[PDB]
Write a protein that binds this DNA or RNA. Structure first.
Length: 432
DNA sequence: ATTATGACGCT
DNA sequence: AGCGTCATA
């Protein structure tokens, strides 16, 4: 009734750089632009592994986690860019620097939460308010929303044949209905957020050349969900009112954080398939199956409601260095293990120093992770030690000190079982 | 031999 | 503290 919270208190956006790694390589090498292309790392094993794919290439069925040799069978003209290799490993510096280009432009408009290298959440609530005062009850022209889609529209009543045609029909339906008289109507607020998102995205492309997609809604999960509805280079407005129809045929695994084991349990235990079917279960029922927190979250989420805040954080919380040693390449000697801990430590030191100079902070804890031959777990062991100095040899030495007793070998010089993964992460930052 | 990252929850 | 889940660069 009148006391039922509807979760329309915020305007939040999710922005995702389209095939980011690919765009970065294409900006630098015009020959790759507007072509089927992919970024790959390494080359020897089956042409190297693919980690990003242009949309031209996706139409051919090329995906990430695919071997380049195999992608070439689906798409013979596919162009490839290799990740830079340093110290015998993949180095992602070019893309991290590129990401900062984007994050710093986004920050001019609103407060952002860096989710990963290529996507961030935006809290547009206060921004929308300010804009709504300048508008002075003035209607919003469709011309201000040239790449916006309104989910669920158009509906009801011959140009409806092409994609752009449909987009505009929906947009006009949405705008014709808007009641601009009310400055507290959630739909008006979402709409103004979309205007701002258009502007943010224009600013990003003009100043970097990078294109992106975006979702606009009242919370992070709906925003994220919306972002993926119309790609590439488009944005989607998912209103609170669109939720029931949209969720009625939305597989549970499409909602963020339900794409794994918990989503599978939800589907198996409850005997449902779509997000909307969740509304038939009381909060208590949900809690009894999935715990108090997930239960409460699910109850609200299937109703389009979520309260997780956009955290004011533009910098990553950790800085890590990682390398897998698969199959026959696994590390089985001591000199081998130390040499790689040293290569990793040397990258880490280089990245931490620049981070201390750029961002006025120092990491204080070193996490060391390894994997042993046979364990299906990403990580077999995790030990942390103190990180007092940015010195590669010290960090590499301390890392060894905390793992050296994992060696089963009776011989000092050999290492068993062979290690299939080394990982050094700097964490626990402090002001400096 | 589905990388090399990143964020977060549980106990 | 050390382990596990979820997500795509």
């Amino acid at each position: 009734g009148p006391h039922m919270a509807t979760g329309q208190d915020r305007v939040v956006a999710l922005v995702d750089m389209d095939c980011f790694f690919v765009q970065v390589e294409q900006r630098q090498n015009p020959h790759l632009r507007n072509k089927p292309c992919a970024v790959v790392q390494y080359k020897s094993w089956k042409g190297g592994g693919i980690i990003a794919v242009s949309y031209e290439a996706r139409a051919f069925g090329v995906t990430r986690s695919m071997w380049a040799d195999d992608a070439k069978k689906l798409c013979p003209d596919l162009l490839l860019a290799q990740v830079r290799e340093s110290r015998g490993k993949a180095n992602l510096t070019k893309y991290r620097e590129a990401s900062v280009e984007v994050m710093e432009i986004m920050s001019r408009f609103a407060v952002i939460e860096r989710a990963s290298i290529d996507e961030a959440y935006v809290d547009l609530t206060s921004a929308v308010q300010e804009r709504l005062q300048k508008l002075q009850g003035q209607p919003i022209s469709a011309d201000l929303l040239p790449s916006t889609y309104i989910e669920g529209l158009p509906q009801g009543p011959e140009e409806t044949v092409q994609k752009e045609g449909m987009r505009k029909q929906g947009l006009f339906q949405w705008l014709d209905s808007l009641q601009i008289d009310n400055l507290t109507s959630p739909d008006l607020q979402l709409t103004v957020g979309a205007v701002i998102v258009e502007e943010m995205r224009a600013a990003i492309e003009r100043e970097t050349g990078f294109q992106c997609s975006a979702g606009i809604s009242h919370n992070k999960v709906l925003a994220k969900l919306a972002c993926g509805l119309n790609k590439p280079n488009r944005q989607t407005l998912v209103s609170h009112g669109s939720v029931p129809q949209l969720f009625s045929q939305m597989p549970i695994r499409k909602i963020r954080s339900l794409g794994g084991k918990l989503g599978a349990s939800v589907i198996e235990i409850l005997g449902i398939e779509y997000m909307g079917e969740l509304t038939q279960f009381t909060e208590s029922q949900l809690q009894s199956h999935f715990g108090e927190k997930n239960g409460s979250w699910l109850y609200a989420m299937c109703r389009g409601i979520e309260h997780d805040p956009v955290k004011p954080r533009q910098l990553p919380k950790t800085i890590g260095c990682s390398k897998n040693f698969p199959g026959k390449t696994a590390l089985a000697t001591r000199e081998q293990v130390q040499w790689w801990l040293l290569q990793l430590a040397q990258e880490l030191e280089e990245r931490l120093t620049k981070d201390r100079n750029d961002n006025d902070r120092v990491a204080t804890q070193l996490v060391v992770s390894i994997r042993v031959q046979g364990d299906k777990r990403l990580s077999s062991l995790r030990r942390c030690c103190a990180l007092t100095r940015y010195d590669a040899h010290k960090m590499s030495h301390d890392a060894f000190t905390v793992i050296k007793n994992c060696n089963t070998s009776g011989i000092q010089t050999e290492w068993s079982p062979p290690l299939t993964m080394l990982f050094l992460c700097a964490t626990k930052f402090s002001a400096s």
